[PDB]
């Protein structure tokens, strides 16, 4: 079922239809890498959900409210009551992935200052730490452990929360490492596991006693904190009848301060937050915000714009429509559902994307010849969808050794930004896939004709083998 | 074939999810009459496709470049430059539909001060003139006749150009009439005709052939001009690879002025236009621009706001763009395919509205009990749609007896507004209609509760019997 | 004293500074006539300030938040709203001056019917009429009066509120007329006479009386509405501690109805309200607003977009703001006071606009050569203002005998929009007086190359003698 | 000469007029700390003219058409556009002050690898290098050097272009340094040194041909290139009839990069860029736009959004606007030199800020005590206009030690938000340092009752001595 639009199309952004020969030319054209496609010749853009999905009327009418004060604005302080009406958090620090970069070295030295945390020794626990979280973490010499479930990455076995904590892990886990050494747990809603797995509140409860118990800072990584919150509402029985936004408070009484990037469920394609409960993480707080302003060894200045930190004060309630976010899921659902139909396998698939098995699709093709990147190509020139390979293309080479890294999986990655594109879309890109399946035998291989040092899936150009 | 959105949605304005029981308390609430409903109960409003469609980013962008001077405006000014560019027309009023009120007594002067235009003879002729055009005509003591063609209300024949002036009837009725006395021809484009009929080109020549000969001027009544190019596009031979751009051009060769509302193909939800095309119709230009200020019989002022000019000077252009108008039509085509589908019938439907014939969905409700009433507030009970009686309700009663008016169709008419709702929208009003299809027994008629003396259609409320 | 803004500029319109030799040439190419300059090339446009203002960010952004149902919109009710809360007025009808052409007939007919008002001897009263109320009425058949007091257009005598009804002479004027014979009072605030002048509560509470004793309608003219509140507030000792809006609700107890633009203080470009108290008027809002449908003798349809119906919920609140109006009105006077200073003498001059006489600045030209025409034009050579000639230009011919009609003063007429220009403006424009006062005896006078029949102020071009 | 804005406003920002006795509780309540005070209980918030200025109607109208994708937007199309056109340099890329983190370090590895650079030697040369930017050398190990002249900080002696490089000092660093170890050359314009200074064309091209000679990077620093080219066709009589956008094309041959922070002269609150003239610097390109994503360690994503590089794209023409600089230039002038003429001194003043000398203003203070703090309180107090304290309050203490730093002068900065104040603003600053000057005696000093440990000026609480 997808379900009808609760809302009316207002603004929308011409794109033109492409000829078959034209989309042929453009590929060429982008060294058969979508990457270096325009956005003009994109009929469908599932590159990426993050800050490409539309916002409501008064989302954008709040963009010319903005005060541009430097200190004391009228917007920080809309934002800031928006979080504490929304998740009950008192302190509020707007970040233009919320400060991942700030919170991680200020919660490693207040543990070394107050409980003789040994840095050789540190490591964090999350139910799934997003990939640029896991970074920082380890740029500040933490090791990271994913406690996730045995249920998480089973496909075929169907579970209401795969994104829970494994609570028995973590216990284990905080005890074998020493608590004293454990600096903060980061609970991610929903979670990157598997393609975007929900958590439930009896879970985060379980998981938040188990971290006051031992004394280790909660941060909240919630990106997708309203689908979360509509999962516990559809999912777990005892929510049921609760509405999002409670659901929403009551969940983050289970965390001691949260990371968003409002990219995502925020519906703006800017902005961020990095909030603290109460006035016990007060003094976590003013070092936050110390370090943001000294975060380079001195002092550097600037901050979201006042019309930004309106938008996100609204969009912060706008996200957590129940029925915009019924909406939105069932649309997920609705096209993984159609490919599953038509005989297409990912190898996972949630809520943050799905990721079809290339490998298996495309089988001629060995993977050095980067089937998931001649699949993309190939759905750029049937029906000018671009999508992102995440396989032994975008893997790369060993940079000690100079030869491809090898790589478990050749997928495809299909994201799709928030109230953006339709049904007919949705039955479009699987009446693609259809083509691309019945197809299959012809779509050539890929081979390089330039290739960077590093970060080659960005500007990389190759041709057919 | 519902085609996909050239577009990508930047923009929407939230609806609520309404359940059943508040629809039906809402709907007594409003006297059983959707005109007193509010917007925010209705879930998909079909009372007009007239200013409430969306819009393209780039038209409401320019809103916001508003040069408000009373005189010498280049807010004007793009907006005149682009009918210029458009339809090859020099002089331009922008209106707040294109002050029929004012060229027709300018029309009927001129002819009465160049050509002795008797008054008491006058006819003017349309291949169909819309509802106020006639009521302007009339009101300045001009009949009017329509020669639309035999094909025209025929359904069941199929006829690419149902909106075709009778170009026989046209010139026996100048010949007929006297030509000193017909003070203009309306070419309406698309026609009002049967739902809505598009004009060929090789049918405007013709046409424009007749009234050149006579010396008779031709006025185009074009709110619909866009969505009528691109039926010729598709369906007049000859135009098959010209763009809609220059269908356009070249059709406007064949009128001497054009009067429109921009509400419906030019994209905007204020502003028409009223153009002369060269200095051959200067003299009816200065006259027109002068009645614009004294219409009243002083000077009154005001006219559309600079920001609205702009806008409506991008609108222009973006309402002719071939894909998006390409997917309009289509999804009108596939509303009204996929109610003859499930064996609803409609007495005329085609690019303006599809008129359901509610006296056949209905027949156990007499028409003194309003069956389209009846069922406009089924269709709102049961899936939140709103659409305008046409029948012995919105007919009324006799001003001269006090009893209804006898009324030969009781038809729900389903108009569309642009760029507004999917494919999922129109997929769940078939389903609505086959909901009340399959429930028709049971479906009451209506009785006044209260009803005012004039227009009771807009604010009466009615009781179930 | 110039105050100093209560507010910050966030939002400019760029405005070139040209040469005196462009606009020499320029003022030439508009045959010495400044209603045909581009508005980009003149620097300080004081053509008028009907919705030439500007506007505060709150309002800007409201136009983004329209529901454009065609009935049953949120934002007509949030501005239905507005004039509840502000006014006190239970019904509002949106209107694109406040449908003069709708309220006029309705209250005839209405005192037709109720008390044998007879239309041969029929007189309506004002304070002030403005031009086109006056218009509307006697295209109506309704001859009217201005109850105007003795100090009004006397200056060198001040005082604090010479647009105050003669309440004696209004007493008279129905008991001369005949109070079956008055169909309404019209309050305009502030009143036009004598360049705007306000209207005591003391005075619109003893206007009321009489009215309320007689039966008479009171219609509030009100595009000044909050100009008046603040002339009270300043002026009117019993009120000088109650707030704008305090004075606004207490001011709208002593009328039954509302009319205005919304062009001028409410500080937008488009719209205008027609209301009525409570449902003592029901009936002449049912009437009305019946009428606004088919006034054309049909019906026709169309009406603010929902965005603008927002802005002006806004509107009426910004333009009450007391530190705005204490520096618009501020401002005004700066601008008259720093003229007087320098020897310009104006006939008269007040909130709405100042009126320079040109005759005595340049006496040595006839008033057939237009001398206020030739001062707007020097005034835009040397310093590219635009003012509007109201004298023998804008009189014009006696349409019976074609001869010039006799005037009785030459003036140029100053009008300020509203938050546009500076106290640096507001000097620029006095300097520029300054060089023309004392180049005086060099400046000639202008005969026609081009003269319309009708209107010719508008599009005239002449040259000089 | 304050000159009249070359421009209309259209929107405001309302700002609310307080009493006295308001803002003494006001400055009570934040701590004798206007960092502290509320935006909205600020009249006249000169902390900052960095993203706080107002923009054009065609700047905020490009917000409307952004183009979010992740790759190949239209919208960094338009700005790399814009920068191709007024700069002459090929590769763009937006920054969200220009990523100084970025090229510094990507600069020294260059001639780390290419010259045999030695980290334990190298010296970076400016003509004054921004603290962020001597912040981001210092960091990554490079000492820096400001190579300015002679007359630069010398007020009392006028010189056109106090912001120039002092070539031969220039020269001789390279030579003494040894040019392998110069991995670049800033060059700052206009100059942060003595309050903002310009740097002349014949300078900047001497600076470069000293650069290329020995194949050395210059880096402009370009955050106010508008007023620098405004300066330069005002001053340097070899370009007195260039337009400003032909002395910035050629201003910009004279460096090979720019950064520059969006915020002052571009006329937005948000963006910077970091651009490369031509393929010569193509691998710093690649390389800057590589760490871009990898700065952290590891990929992190994100960027402006789409309707700001539009508005970018447009806001570095509209910056150039002659009219404009012009009029922004005077005005800050115009402040200087009121203040001077009521015996205000400062101790440097120029384009960017004016440095008031509250040392000896308010001589009975002692320095410990926070004399330019007691005044930005007075001048709250007396005016509501909040201005920054750069003395000893700033500077703070010795974090080896716990005392105060000693600090040669106490100083009061005044910044002037771009098109956001009036003249009528800049009379109402003078008259409140009249007020205070003339009741200097009065004045308090302060001291702490609450004192961070570190960047204590944002966020202390003072009360009075
Ligand atoms: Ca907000
Ligand atoms: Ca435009
Ligand atoms: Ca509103
Ligand atoms: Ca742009
Ligand atoms: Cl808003
Ligand atoms: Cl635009
Ligand atoms: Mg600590
Ligand atoms: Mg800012
Ligand atoms: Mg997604
Ligand atoms: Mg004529
Ligand atoms: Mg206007
Ligand atoms: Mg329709
Ligand atoms: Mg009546
Ligand atoms: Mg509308
Ligand atoms: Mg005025
Ligand atoms: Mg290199
Ligand atoms: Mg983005
Ligand atoms: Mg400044
Ligand atoms: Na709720
Ligand atoms: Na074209
Ligand atoms: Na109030
Ligand atoms: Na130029």
């Known amino acids: 079922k997808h379900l009808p639009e609760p809302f009316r199309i207002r603004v929308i952004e011409p794109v033109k239809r492409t000829t078959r020969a034209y989309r042929e030319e453009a590929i060429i054209k982008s060294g058969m890498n979508p990457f270096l496609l325009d956005s003009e010749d994109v009929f469908i853009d599932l590159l990426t959900d993050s800050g490409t999905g539309a ?64 840095r050789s020794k540190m490591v964090a626990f999350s139910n799934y730490f997003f990939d640029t979280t896991q970074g920082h973490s380890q740029i500040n010499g933490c090791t990271v452990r994913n406690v996730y479930i045995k249920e998480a990455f089973d496909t075929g076995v169907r579970y209401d929360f795969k994104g829970n904590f494994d609570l028995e892990g973590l216990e284990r886990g905080i005890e074998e490492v020493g608590p004293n050494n454990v600096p903060y747990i980061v609970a991610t809603i929903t979670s990157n596991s598997a393609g975007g797995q929900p958590v439930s509140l009896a879970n985060l409860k379980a998981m938040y006693s188990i971290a006051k118990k031992y004394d280790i800072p909660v941060v909240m990584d919630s990106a997708r904190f309203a689908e979360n919150a509509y999962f516990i509402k559809q999912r777990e029985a005892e929510y049921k009848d609760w509405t999002i936004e409670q659901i929403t408070r009551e969940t983050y009484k289970y965390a001691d301060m949260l990371a968003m990037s409002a990219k995502k469920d925020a519906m703006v394609p800017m902005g961020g937050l990095l909030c603290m409960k109460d006035d016990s993480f007060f ?33 912060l309630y706008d996200g957590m429509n129940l029925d915009w976010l019924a909406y939105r899921i069932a649309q997920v ?57 995440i396989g032994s293309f975008l893997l790369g080479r060993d940079p000690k050794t100079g030869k491809q890294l090898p790589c478990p999986a050749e997928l495809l990655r299909l994201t799709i930004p928030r109230a953006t594109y339709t049904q007919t879309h949705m039955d479009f890109i699987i009446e693609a896939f259809k083509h691309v399946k019945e197809n299959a035998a012809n779509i050539k291989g890929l081979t390089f004709t330039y290739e960077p040092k590093v970060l080659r899936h960005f500007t990389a150009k190759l041709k057919e083998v």
């Open 283 to 315: 003094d976590v707080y003013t070092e936050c915000r110390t370090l943001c302003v000294v975060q380079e060894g001195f002092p550097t200045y600037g901050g979201l714009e006042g019309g930004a930190m309106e938008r996100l004060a609204v969009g």
């Open 55 to 118: 916002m409501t009327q008064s989302m954008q009418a709040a963009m010319m409210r903005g005060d541009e004060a430097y200190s004391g604005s009228r917007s920080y302080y809309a934002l800031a009551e928006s979080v504490k009406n929304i998740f009950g958090y008192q302190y509020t620090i707007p970040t233009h992935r919320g400060a991942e970069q700030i919170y991680i070295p200020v919660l490693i030295k207040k543990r070394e200052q107050e409980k003789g945390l040994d």
């Open 333 to 389: 659902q609705y096209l993984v559902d159609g490919l599953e139909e038509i005989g297409v396998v990912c190898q996972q698939a949630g809520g943050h994307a799905a990721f079809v098995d290339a490998g298996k699709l495309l089988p001629h093709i060995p993977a050095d010849q980067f089937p998931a990147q001649a699949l993309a190509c190939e759905l750029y020139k049937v029906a000018g969808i671009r999508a992102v390979e």
